[PDB]
Amino acid sequence: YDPNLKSIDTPPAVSQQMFNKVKSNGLGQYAYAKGLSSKFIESEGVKLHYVEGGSKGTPIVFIHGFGSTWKMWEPVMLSYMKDHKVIAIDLPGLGQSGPILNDDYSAENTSKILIGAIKKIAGKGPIYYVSHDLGNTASYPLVANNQGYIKKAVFMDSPIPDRAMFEYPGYTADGPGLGWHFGYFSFGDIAEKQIANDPNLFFSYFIKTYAGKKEIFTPELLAELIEPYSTRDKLKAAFGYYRSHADSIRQNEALLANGKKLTIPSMALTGQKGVNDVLVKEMRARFVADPAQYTAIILPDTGHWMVEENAEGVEKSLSNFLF
Amino acid sequence: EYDPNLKSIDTPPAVSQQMFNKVKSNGLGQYAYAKGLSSKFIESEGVKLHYVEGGSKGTPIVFIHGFGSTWKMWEPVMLSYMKDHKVIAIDLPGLGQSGPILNDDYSAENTSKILIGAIKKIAGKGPIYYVSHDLGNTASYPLVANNQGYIKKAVFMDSPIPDRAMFEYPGYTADGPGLGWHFGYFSFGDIAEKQIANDPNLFFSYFIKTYAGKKEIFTPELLAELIEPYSTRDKLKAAFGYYRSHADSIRQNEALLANGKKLTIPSMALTGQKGVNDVLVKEMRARFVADPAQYTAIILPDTGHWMVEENAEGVEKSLSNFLF
Numbered sequence: 001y002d003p004n005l006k007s008i009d010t011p012p013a014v015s016q017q018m019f020n021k022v023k024s025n026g027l028g029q030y031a032y033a034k035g036l037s038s039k040f041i042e043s044e045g046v047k048l049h050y051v052e053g054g055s056k057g058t059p060i061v062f063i064h065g066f067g068s069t070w071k072m073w074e075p076v077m078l079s080y081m082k083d084h085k086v087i088a089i090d091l092p093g094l095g096q097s098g099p100i101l102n103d104d105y106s107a108e109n110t111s112k113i114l115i116g117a118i119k120k121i122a123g124k125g126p127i128y129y130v131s132h133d134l135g136n137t138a139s140y141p142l143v144a145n146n147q148g149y150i151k152k153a154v155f156m157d158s159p160i161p162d163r164a165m166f167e168y169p170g171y172t173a174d175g176p177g178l179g180w181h182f183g184y185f186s187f188g189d190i191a192e193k194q195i196a197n198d199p200n201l202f203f204s205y206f207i208k209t210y211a212g213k214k215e216i217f218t219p220e221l222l223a224e225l226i227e228p229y230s231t232r233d234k235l236k237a238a239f240g241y242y243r244s245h246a247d248s249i250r251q252n253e254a255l256l257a258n259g260k261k262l263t264i265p266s267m268a269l270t271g272q273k274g275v276n277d278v279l280v281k282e283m284r285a286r287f288v289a290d291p292a293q294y295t296a297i298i299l300p301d302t303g304h305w306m307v308e309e310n311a312e313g314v315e316k317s318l319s320n321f322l323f
Numbered sequence: 324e325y326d327p328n329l330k331s332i333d334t335p336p337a338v339s340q341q342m343f344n345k346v347k348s349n350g351l352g353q354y355a356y357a358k359g360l361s362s363k364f365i366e367s368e369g370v371k372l373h374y375v376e377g378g379s380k381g382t383p384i385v386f387i388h389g390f391g392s393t394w395k396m397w398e399p400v401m402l403s404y405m406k407d408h409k410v411i412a413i414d415l416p417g418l419g420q421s422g423p424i425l426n427d428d429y430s431a432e433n434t435s436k437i438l439i440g441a442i443k444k445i446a447g448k449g450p451i452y453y454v455s456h457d458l459g460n461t462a463s464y465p466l467v468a469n470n471q472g473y474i475k476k477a478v479f480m481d482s483p484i485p486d487r488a489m490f491e492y493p494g495y496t497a498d499g500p501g502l503g504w505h506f507g508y509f510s511f512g513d514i515a516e517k518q519i520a521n522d523p524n525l526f527f528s529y530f531i532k533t534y535a536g537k538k539e540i541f542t543p544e545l546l547a548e549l550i551e552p553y554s555t556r557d558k559l560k561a562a563f564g565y566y567r568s569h570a571d572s573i574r575q576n577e578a579l580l581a582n583g584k585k586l587t588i589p590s591m592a593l594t595g596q597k598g599v600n601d602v603l604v605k606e607m608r609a610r611f612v613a614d615p616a617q618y619t620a621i622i623l624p625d626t627g628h629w630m631v632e633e634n635a636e637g638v639e640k641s642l643s644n645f646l647f
Contacts, residue, residue: 169492169493182500
């Protein structure tokens with residue numbers, strides 16, 4: 001939290017002009033760099049958007065989270081595609097993926113949707129799997145239940161839903177705590193509605209609060225990052241993950257109680273100025289069978305939006321761990 | 324209690340604003356005082372406070388509302404007691420018809436200082452009984468702790484008194500959004516102020532019904548009356564100042580508790596089973612009371628956070644038995 005950060009005063013109508021420009025000119029989530037291919041695939045009745053590059057080499061699957069789309073991974077995808085098949089999927093309901101109509105955005109359901117698509121896109125495997133933010137919510141069952149097919153897994157910054165997610169405090173001595181948004185985002189359809197009235201206002205403040213390098217987030221970049229979350233339908237989907245967290249927690253806790261910890265190499269890669277050490281301690285204590293297979297890296301001076309803020313640190317950390 | 328099936332309204336903000344305008348122009352809601360009651364204002368530490376009083380003889384009872392409320396929440400209790408008691412209900416600094424704390428210091432110590440000055444003038448030299456609800460519990464602990472004797476007995480209702488545990492209440496629970504989440508949202512820059520000002524009826528209709536046990540009571544017209552007082556940025560800014568100031572209030576109350584300034588006068592935690600429930604009951608017993616023999620804890624069944632709206636009988640009986 002930053003007591004000194006100001007919220008914007010941009011009129012929502014002006015912000016909508018910015019979002020429209022992004023969509024009309026194929027910028028942001030719609031901009032696919034040379035070598036990358038935008039595609040759609042149906043899985044369990046859900047139309048998923050994904051972007052892929054490369055061909056030979058162990059495939060690497062990248063799953064974004066809240067405030068992001070496949071786009072967050074583009075710099076890393078570009079770096080790796082000469083040596084690896086790279087695949088970045090928009091989570092169900094977000095980016096250019098369609099919604100889960102029965103509102104079951106729990107880890108088990110999203111993992112079922114994702115693995116089916118991945119098996120078709122990536123092929124026989126094995127593959128590497130890399131996740132950030134809600135990606136970590138969507139993915140634990142997928143990873144835990146497909147070890148072998150998944151040869152190594154990385155979770156970034158955000159905690160994996162577990163018992164502690166019923167504990168993170170709403171308020172702290174430093175102001176608003178890690179826990180508060182888990183509550184606001186699951187509080188009826190209130191966040192969807194309020195944020196839909198002025199997405200630029202909420203997200204400009206939210207995104208910068210969780211950034212270490214705030215200067216990276218110019219109004220232009222923010223317009224590109226917020227456009228995919230600028231409508232009620234996309235916000236409803238996003239907040240479905242939050243509504244479903246209690247389900248996700250029960251599901252992951254059941255997995256751990258049945259012994260389904262990670263027995264493949266895994267990494268917690270976090271930003272010191274982001275969620276910082278929560279995921280590192282969590283994975284070490286509860287999710288890894290053998291600490292010797294576990295790597296923890298906390299990037300200094302780097303906030304939650306790890307590739308935006310430190311693409312080089314992320315690429316190097318991933319390369320050192322995966323390859 | 325949280326109900327995942329409760330629907331938010333879809334009333335257009337402009338239509339809601341006309342509801343608010345009607346409340347004000349017709350003198351309803353916070354502007355409506357029953358026969359026997361008088362609306363007055365008083366300056367304390369440069370802050371103009373609004374209050375309503377009734378009665379004359381008998382131990383005075385001062386009532387302090389919290390978030391989502393004004394003095395108005397106390398009216399039925401005030402009417403019930405005014406025959407035998409001076410009764411005084413004050414709008415918290417910044418809220419209802421009270422003016423704001425200009426330096427944004429809505430910490431317990433500051434609001435307690437502003438309140439005690441006015442109370443001494445309105446209520447007289449004492450002693451008095453002190454009854455607090457919701458943010459009243461945030462505004463008032465130093466007032467009560469530092470003025471024991473002048474305050475003969477004290478009641479805190481439903482909400483926790485700021486202490487170290489407020490740094491622990493979870494944002495999320497197996498039951499959905501937790502007790503902690505609003506403490507974060509309300510102190511998250513000026514975002515709550517700005518978002519809620521855009522459609523106060525939408526936010527408060529859902530918020531108020533959520534924490535109600537008896538939801539049917541909250542008709543659109545009652546909601547309009549409850550929300551009108553929180554329908555502008557200036558009123559929301561003040562409300563959320565209490566939340567920005569909670570870390571301060573916590574330090575202040577912890578310091579009082581550590582300096583023995585626990586409660587040595589009789590005290591009561593009075594809560595609603597369907598509201599915050601047992602948090603305050605456990606908190607006061609464990610940390611705020613010097614002698615358990617002086618402490619009463621009552622949790623009203625089938626009653627949510629808005630305890631006088633939902634169970635005036637339960638509140639009056641509990642206060643009467645404790646106070647008298």
